[PDB]
Amino acid sequence: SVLTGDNQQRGSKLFKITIALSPTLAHHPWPGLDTHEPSQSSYSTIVSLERLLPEMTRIKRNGGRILEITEGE
Amino acid sequence: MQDAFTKAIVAADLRGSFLSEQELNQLTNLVKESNKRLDAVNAITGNAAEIISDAAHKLFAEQTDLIRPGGNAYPNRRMAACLRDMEIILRYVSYALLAGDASVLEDRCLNGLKETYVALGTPTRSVARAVQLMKETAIGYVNSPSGVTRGDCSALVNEAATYFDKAAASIA
Amino acid sequence: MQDAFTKAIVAADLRGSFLSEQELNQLTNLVKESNKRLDAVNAITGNAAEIISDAAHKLFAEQTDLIRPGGNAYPNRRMAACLRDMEIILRYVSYALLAGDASVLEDRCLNGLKETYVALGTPTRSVARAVQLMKETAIGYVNSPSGVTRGDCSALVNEAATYFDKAAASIA
Amino acid sequence: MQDAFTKAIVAADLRGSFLSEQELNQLTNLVKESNKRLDAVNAITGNAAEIISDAAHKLFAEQTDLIRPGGNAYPNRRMAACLRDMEIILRYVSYALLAGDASVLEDRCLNGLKETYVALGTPTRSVARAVQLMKETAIGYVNSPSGVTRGDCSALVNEAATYFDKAAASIA
Amino acid sequence: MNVLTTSSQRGGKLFKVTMTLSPALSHHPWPSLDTYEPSQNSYSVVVPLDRLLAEMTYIKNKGGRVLDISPADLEALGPPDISSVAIPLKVELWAKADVSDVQAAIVAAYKQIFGNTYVLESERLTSAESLLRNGSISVREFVRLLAKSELYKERFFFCTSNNRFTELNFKHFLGRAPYNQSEIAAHLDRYQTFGYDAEIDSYIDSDEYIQAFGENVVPYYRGFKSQSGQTVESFNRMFKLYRGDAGSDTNLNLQGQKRRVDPKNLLRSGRGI
Amino acid sequence: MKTVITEVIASADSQGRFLNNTELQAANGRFQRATASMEAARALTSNADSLVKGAVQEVYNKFPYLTQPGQMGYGDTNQAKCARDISHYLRFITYSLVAGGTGPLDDYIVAGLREVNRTFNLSPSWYIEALKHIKGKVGSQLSGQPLTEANAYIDYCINALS
Amino acid sequence: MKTVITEVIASADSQGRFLNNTELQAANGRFQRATASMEAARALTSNADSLVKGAVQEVYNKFPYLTQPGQMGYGDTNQAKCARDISHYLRFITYSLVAGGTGPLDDYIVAGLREVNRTFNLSPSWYIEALKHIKGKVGSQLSGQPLTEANAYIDYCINALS
Amino acid sequence: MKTVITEVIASADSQGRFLNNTELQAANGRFQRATASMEAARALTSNADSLVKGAVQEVYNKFPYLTQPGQMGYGDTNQAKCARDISHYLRFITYSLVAGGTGPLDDYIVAGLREVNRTFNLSPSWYIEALKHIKGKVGSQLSGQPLTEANAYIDYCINALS
Amino acid sequence: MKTVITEVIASADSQGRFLNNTELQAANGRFQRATASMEAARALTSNADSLVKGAVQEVYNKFPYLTQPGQMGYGDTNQAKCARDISHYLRFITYSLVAGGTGPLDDYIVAGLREVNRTFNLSPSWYIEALKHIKGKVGSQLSGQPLTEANAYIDYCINALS
Ligand SMILES: *[C@H](C)[C@H]1/C(=C/c2[nH]c(/C=C3N=C(/C=C4\NC(=O)C(CC)=C4C)C(C)=C\3CCC(=O)O)c(CCC(=O)O)c2C)NC(=O)[C@@H]1C
Ligand SMILES: *[C@H](C)[C@H]1/C(=C/c2[nH]c(/C=C3N=C(/C=C4\NC(=O)C(CC)=C4C)C(C)=C\3CCC(=O)O)c(CCC(=O)O)c2C)NC(=O)[C@@H]1C
Ligand SMILES: *[C@H](C)[C@H]1/C(=C/c2[nH]c(/C=C3N=C(/C=C4\NC(=O)C(CC)=C4C)C(C)=C\3CCC(=O)O)c(CCC(=O)O)c2C)NC(=O)[C@@H]1C
Ligand SMILES: *[C@H](C)[C@H]1/C(=C/c2[nH]c(/C=C3N=C(/C=C4\NC(=O)C(CC)=C4C)C(C)=C\3CCC(=O)O)c(CCC(=O)O)c2C)NC(=O)[C@@H]1C
Ligand SMILES: *[C@H](C)[C@H]1/C(=C/c2[nH]c(/C=C3N=C(/C=C4\NC(=O)C(CC)=C4C)C(C)=C\3CCC(=O)O)c(CCC(=O)O)c2C)NC(=O)[C@@H]1C
Ligand SMILES: *[C@H](C)[C@H]1/C(=C/c2[nH]c(/C=C3N=C(/C=C4\NC(=O)C(CC)=C4C)C(C)=C\3CCC(=O)O)c(CCC(=O)O)c2C)NC(=O)[C@@H]1C
Ligand SMILES: *[C@H](C)[C@H]1/C(=C/c2[nH]c(/C=C3N=C(/C=C4\NC(=O)C(CC)=C4C)C(C)=C\3CCC(=O)O)c(CCC(=O)O)c2C)NC(=O)[C@@H]1C
Ligand SMILES: *[C@H](C)[C@H]1/C(=C/c2[nH]c(/C=C3N=C(/C=C4\NC(=O)C(CC)=C4C)C(C)=C\3CCC(=O)O)c(CCC(=O)O)c2C)NC(=O)[C@@H]1C
Ligand SMILES: *[C@H](C)[C@H]1/C(=C/c2[nH]c(/C=C3N=C(/C=C4\NC(=O)C(CC)=C4C)C(C)=C\3CCC(=O)O)c(CCC(=O)O)c2C)NC(=O)[C@@H]1C
Ligand SMILES: *[C@H](C)[C@H]1/C(=C/c2[nH]c(/C=C3N=C(/C=C4\NC(=O)C(CC)=C4C)C(C)=C\3CCC(=O)O)c(CCC(=O)O)c2C)NC(=O)[C@@H]1C
Ligand SMILES: *[C@H](C)[C@H]1/C(=C/c2[nH]c(/C=C3N=C(/C=C4\NC(=O)C(CC)=C4C)C(C)=C\3CCC(=O)O)c(CCC(=O)O)c2C)NC(=O)[C@@H]1C
Ligand SMILES: *[C@H](C)[C@H]1/C(=C/c2[nH]c(/C=C3N=C(/C=C4\NC(=O)C(CC)=C4C)C(C)=C\3CCC(=O)O)c(CCC(=O)O)c2C)NC(=O)[C@@H]1C
């Protein structure tokens, strides 16, 4: 997701992370095995340096892996 | 407590006004029906014992478990209660019918009845059922008397129903 | 949620039985009125804005103090809320009217309403008043429409009333 | 119950100790003021009726709606209550003033007051107002008496205020 | 307790009073020191309006003190219907969402995130809405912006105590009610050191979030239906936290921000640490 | 609120018994009476205003000094109040006629009458005159039972006031 | 003894107040009704005997076995009693009509009914039939309000018995 | 807690009336006396210790056997307690003087005195001596009203103990 | 009758306990005050008459219309009464001072005040003026505590009357 502006109101240096998405990370609210969306196999979210550690760790434990990290700007 | 007349008053009071002529005409006509109204009540009271007796029989024929060991109408003690309760509800309904207002029945009996029944473990469902059974029997009498001047009681009959139903609903 | 049909079903279910033929005939008839029923709803929705606008004007003409500093409809912020609320109640009422059942209204809207109003310090009396004011205006439209095939809507009109009144009562 | 003296004791008790000489000197001086203290009380009690009468007049001049049909001070019955209440609060305040301690006031009087007012639908705001109105009038007398030795009562006057205010706050 | 009649036979609004009993007020007829019975430390009576004044004064003149008074009409009312929260409903924001679908997620998000609390047009947040619908923000990220907004702090966090703000958060961000004091304590500490922003993050960051309503699903009420690792009491708590539809979390009401879940109830489900 | 109908219900309820013949007889009494009562109310309601003017006025004639400055009757506010009050009394009386019991009167007017009056220094006497003057006027527009009813209630207040 | 008149007095007395309009209305009801009530009583009083015979009889038809030896219906003494009793019930019913309240019935017949009946093993059922049979006969000699009144009271007992 | 001031409030409160002259008179009494009371307290507070030693001691002289092994007076723990106790009594007496009422005494010392003493087999007698011995010493350091006050309170306990 | 002394006895008696120091303190208060109280009484007693004349008079100035024919103030009988009454108030205030409590005032005058006044249509207002006028005069003959006392009691009535 291309950042239209700095997403985060609280301000630090912001990094764009692109992740391969497990079904767990974004299960659809459906009966049977939850399926992450087809359209976005790779969600891409800008993240403040402060929240970057948590976000990564949570991504890691969930199947999905970091395709690539890029500074937001 | 409250009744049709008193009620209208109270409303009028908060507006701060004399009664509207329109409003009088509600009461004026209400008066006219009195005689019918009364006989209706009289019919219930006259047949009371029966109404209940009847309803009970039917209630227990249907829900045989109530009267089985482990059920709620067993043993005697409980059974007695259950009969007593039915009666009460009836009594209140009648009261309302005369007043021409639900208030008395709801405040004196219904408000909190459900929860009581719940706490005890009485199945509210069945209670409601009984109330209906009663309703039908009661109407039966109200609507089919002998030696009364023949005419139309429907208006009253329906109001009667409603009262029974408020009961059924709030209990249920 | 619930409505006339579903309701009757549920009742039938607890008895454990197919629907009684008598009971079908309630629903059969209910269907027939549909068209009338619908137009009623349509009339409310069509006039919504107005209904409220109107009722409000009258409400404030009566209880001048609500809009005075220290009153409950002052200042703007509060006024806004009060208008919003009126509308909501209306919205629900309409819903009910279509469903042919009070439930939706009771569960979403009325349930807890009194207590809220209390906690806030909102004078329940006035709220109730507003609801009635609305009622009358609303009926006004339901009952006097334009381009509709002429017939008798009373049955619907009364049911409408009842809904409004349940509202008035539970709030009050 | 409690009062200035008793209080200091209690504190001392939990430390497990005789009273500190410093602490005695609080009480010693408190005694000295007695005479002033007393006259203060006397002034309130002497003028009681008036204090209230006055405050009320002003209260109703301000909040006209209270006395209008639909308001909280209408009808007579309610009005009576409202007067009675004011008085009570006063009574307590006086008590406190003599004791030299808020407690009595808080525990007997203020405790539960707010909630009552809420449940009834009495507007707490207005109640608080009345309390203040009283306060001012009362001070008026405390501070301007007849036949009393001229001197400074401020210390007492302020403490008086505080009591009134605790009242106002907890009610509000 | 349940009251069985709303009004006295003579017309009169019954009020239910609750008090802490005292030995003077009721005592066993035994020899030795006078004791009340333990099970009635908090006693409750229903009194007409007329006797209310005298009854309350007597209670207070003895060692009693009035825990609370409440009209018997409000009391002796149904526990709130759970019809609408038994099955929440659930909103998904698809990618390439229509103008309308985005709207409907926004509304739902306000409703859940703010409690039935009304949000005025001036209160609403254009900027964060603007981000949703051109992409760039998830539903989960929007939710994090709301709970960062002043509007949110003004209502739930600046009026009440942290202990209440916690459960108030538990409800908005997870349907669940809180389970065990441990949870309340951890949030209180996190708030002291990290501060308000970290606390908010930790709900949205937590595994329950994402495991349920992970991303791009507006959060919905999980409680009221059986959840994993959820004490039973929690289910009763939910009935205290959630009163009806058209019941809210309001700072606006008299003594607006109190604690629905008495601290002793939390301690029941699990005491330790 | 005390009306015939409410009372018998109450009595029945206390004993825990169905409404039997006894009570219905009573009810019958009320409602039969109503026709007269109702008539009376229509008459008072219509002439309300005029009765009020006349009364207020009367009071001043009866107690000239009230209109002097520094008194209670003096300055419009007070006059307005005085009007209001008398109108309120009339409204309750009309209500009572219709309700068929003193109920409405008792609860609005009578209960707490004394203390109100004491604290604001309203002299019962005044009200009374108002009423009397009224009674006199009513004694023209009405006749027979309708009249009788009107009186009863008007008096009931006189007695309560005094 | 509970009659309309006694009750309103009682209610007035409890509150500590003079009889006001409320109560008189009620009283009025009792008096206007009386004319019908009184009529009914004259009718029952006259046909008493015949009603009684018919009733007693009925009971036996309804419960043949009673007349068999070793039973309660058997031997004249018992029959005499049975007659007496029904006659007593009738007298109280007449008394009530006139008094204009259930009073007389309550105090003589009803209070203690159960225990008496239990200790002597009188089956309510019997009495009931008696009454019903009566009611049926009365349903000829009377008409309109007079009838209605008679019924009310007769029933009141049925309900008490059952 | 019972002091002069609390009581008059209580009495006033019960009847539901304002503090009038009657009560203030009483209050005044308490305040006038205080000066003497206060003095007495300062005197006891200062000599506390010495009074205590002397008392404890006395008791042993009076009841030699207590100090023998296997008795209560024997072994330091007990002696410590014995000291403590007497000191507590003195503290309450000082508190009472200042409070201007028996209140403090009643609630701490007196209420439950008996049962405590019974269950632990403390003989009232002992305490008493302690007190008496004290009273005697106090009868030197004080004089006039100050003295009188001290006595009153000391005694009050004697009476409660016995 | 409520005086300081009676009350403490009462309170002592209720609890079932001996008069302890607490109550005596209170008593003492009453006695110390008496000297002032007594003085005040001697002063009122002496000037009685003159105070009375002045008061009665005042009332008439304040309410001219009273002296007009057909009013209450009119015709000697009434004037005599009016005098008497105020003299009764004067004698009883004096009694209270001496008794050292409101007691005498309460049962003799305050009790039943309202209803008496209602049934005979005595307007409290009047009395009040009388008192006020008095208070003003007394505010010359007396000074310091004696004065203060006199006031207290005079007022106590004002409050009771209003
Ligand atoms: C009968 C149709 C059904 C039934 C009834 C039932 N009720 C109880 C117990 C109680 N019944 C009541 C109800 C009332 N008491 C009142 O005063 C009023 C008016 C406000 C009502 C309607 C109450 C409160 C009790 C408890 C007091 C008592 O026992 O007298 C029972 C017995 C259960 C028990 O454990 O007490 C029963 C059986 N339940 C059924 O099974 C029927 C379907
Ligand atoms: C309606 C449920 C059934 C019915 C009623 C009915 N009643 C009347 C007329 C009267 N009914 C009464 C009855 C009473 N009046 C009283 O004062 C009392 C209590 C003491 C009663 C019970 C009276 C007196 C009348 C007037 C005429 C008469 O002789 O009955 C009517 C006729 C219409 C009217 O209101 O007058 C009707 C229809 N009759 C039915 O067939 C209905 C099923
Ligand atoms: C009743 C409040 C007033 C009224 C209504 C009325 N309507 C009809 C008949 C119809 N009205 C509709 C309207 C709708 N049907 C739908 O499906 C919808 C939503 C898409 C609407 C708005 C229709 C289709 C009919 C049938 C065709 C027709 O209009 O003739 C009637 C006639 C009764 C009947 O349908 O059997 C009436 C009376 N008219 C009044 O007089 C009332 C004031
Ligand atoms: C007057 C300034 C305002 C006002 C007062 C008001 N109060 C009531 C009713 C009650 N007030 C109380 C008060 C107390 N409860 C306590 O415990 C204490 C302290 C110990 C007090 C002072 C209580 C108990 C009641 C209820 C019972 C009663 O009969 O009073 C009312 C009437 C409420 C009603 O609806 O009947 C009123 C009017 N309200 C106003 O309008 C003023 C601003
Ligand atoms: C304070 C608001 C006003 C004020 C007070 C004031 N009073 C005194 C002195 C006394 N006042 C009393 C009054 C009483 N003592 C009692 O025992 C009783 C109850 C029966 C009362 C009512 C007394 C006895 C005294 C002592 C003698 C005297 O009156 O002078 C003073 C003097 C200072 C002092 O502390 O003694 C003062 C200042 N005077 C003001 O200026 C205030 C308006
Ligand atoms: C003693 C081993 C420990 C202790 C006990 C203690 N209890 C209280 C006060 C109360 N205790 C009870 C207990 C009961 N009341 C009952 O009726 C029953 C049996 C049915 C019990 C067991 C109660 C109710 C009270 C409060 C009221 C009363 O006096 O009855 C205290 C005093 C508390 C106070 O501050 O008043 C104490 C000390 N606490 C200890 O110190 C011990 C560890
Ligand atoms: C220290 C002076 C005394 C003391 C404190 C103490 N507190 C706890 C535990 C808690 N304190 C709180 C209270 C709060 N809730 C809030 O919202 C706020 C801010 C407004 C506070 C202060 C809470 C929730 C807890 C629970 C656990 C936690 O740490 O958050 C303890 C620990 C004991 C326990 O958890 O059972 C202590 C020691 N108590 C003392 O002994 C000191 C005299
Ligand atoms: C208007 C007729 C009267 C009035 C209303 C009023 N309401 C509030 C505040 C609230 N009103 C509600 C209402 C509802 N919540 C719901 O969800 C529903 C049904 C779904 C309803 C009807 C709620 C939730 C609130 C609280 C949140 C809010 O900010 O509104 C107020 C403002 C209260 C305040 O003190 O801020 C008012 C004024 N009051 C009047 O003056 C009219 C008589
Ligand atoms: C008219 C004969 C005289 C008069 C009267 C007058 N009344 C007041 C003030 C009040 N009057 C009442 C009376 C009622 N208010 C009610 O709610 C009811 C029951 C429905 C009654 C009968 C009350 C309660 C008041 C108090 C405050 C208020 O205005 O409501 C005044 C003002 C006196 C004052 O100082 O408050 C007056 C003057 N006016 C005249 O000119 C005549 C002498
Ligand atoms: C008639 C249907 C049956 C019958 C009756 C019968 N009755 C008794 C005994 C008693 N009957 C009564 C009844 C009353 N006496 C009263 O004073 C009153 C109130 C006014 C009533 C209703 C009483 C009290 C008795 C018991 C004492 C007595 O001997 O009078 C009997 C005899 C029973 C016995 O054990 O001796 C009988 C048989 N006889 C029939 O043929 C029918 C079966
Ligand atoms: C001294 C004259 C004799 C003596 C006494 C002694 N006392 C105890 C034990 C207790 N004494 C008390 C007394 C009080 N405790 C209080 O809280 C108060 C109120 C302030 C008093 C007066 C109590 C309660 C105890 C019981 C337990 C305790 O630890 O205090 C003992 C010990 C006996 C035992 O079995 O514990 C003794 C010996 N000691 C002497 O030397 C004298 C003979
Ligand atoms: C003086 C301000 C006005 C006045 C007085 C007056 N009084 C009466 C009648 C009575 N006076 C009293 C008062 C008292 N009697 C007592 O026993 C006591 C307590 C010790 C008091 C205060 C009483 C009881 C009466 C009524 C019966 C009696 O005759 O004693 C009247 C006569 C009124 C009448 O007869 O209806 C009058 C006129 N007279 C004036 O000029 C002033 C207006």
Numbering used by the authors:
A (entry chain A): 1 to 73
B (entry chain O), C (entry chain F), D (entry chain U): 1 to 172
E (entry chain M): 1 to 273
F (entry chain N), G (entry chain R), H (entry chain T), I (entry chain P): 1 to 162
Quote the paper:
Cyanobacteria and red algae use extramembranous antenna megacomplexes called phycobilisomes (PBSs), composed of phycobiliproteins (PBPs), to harvest light. A typical PBS contains an allophycocyanin (AP) core—two, three, or five cylinders of (αβ)3 trimers of AP—and a set of radiating rods—stacks of hexamers formed by αβ protomers of phycocyanin (PC) and, in red algae and some cyanobacteria, phycoerythrin (PE). Here, we reconstructed a cryo–electron microscopy structure of the >10-megadalton Gloeobacter violaceus PBS, with diverging, conformationally mobile bundles of rods composed of stacked phycoerythrin and phycocyanin hexamers, stemming from a pentacylindrical allophycocyanin core belted by auxiliary phycocyanin hexamers. The bundle-shaped morphology is maintained by linker proteins, including the multidomain linkers Glr1262 and Glr2806, which are unique to Gloeobacter.
The reconstructed cryo-EM structure revealed three pairs of C2 symmetry–related rods stemming from the top of the pentacylindrical AP core (R1/R1′, R2/R2′, and R3/R3′). Although two PC (αβ)6 hexamer stacks could be confidently built in each rod, the density of the third PC hexamer and PE (αβ)6 hexamers only permitted approximate placement. We located the conserved rod linkers, CpcC1 and CpcC2 (22), which contain pfam01383 and pfam00427 domains that connect two neighboring PC layers. The density helped unequivocally localize Glr1262 on the first level of PC hexamers in the rods, consistent with its predicted position. The three REP domains (pfam00427) of Glr1262 were identified at vertices of an equilateral triangle, which corresponded to the cavities of three PC hexamers that formed the base of a rod bundle. (C) Topology of the two copies of Glr1262 on top of the core showing relative positions of the repeat domains REP1, REP2, and REP3 that attach bases of the rods R1/R1′, R2/R2′, and R3/R3′, respectively, by clustering them as two rod bundles. # indicates the C terminus of the Glr1262 chain. Two copies of Glr1262, each with three REP domains, are necessary and sufficient to cluster the six rods symmetrically into two triangular rod bundles. The REP1-REP2 arm (residues 280 to 350) of Glr1262 interacts with the C/C′ cylinder residues, and the REP2-REP3 arm interacts with the B cylinder of the AP core. In the absence of a CpcG homolog in the genome, a rod-core linker found in studied cyanobacteria, Glr1262 apparently plays this role in Gloeobacter. The bundles of rods position multiple PCB chromophores within 35 Å of each other, which is sufficient for interrod EET.
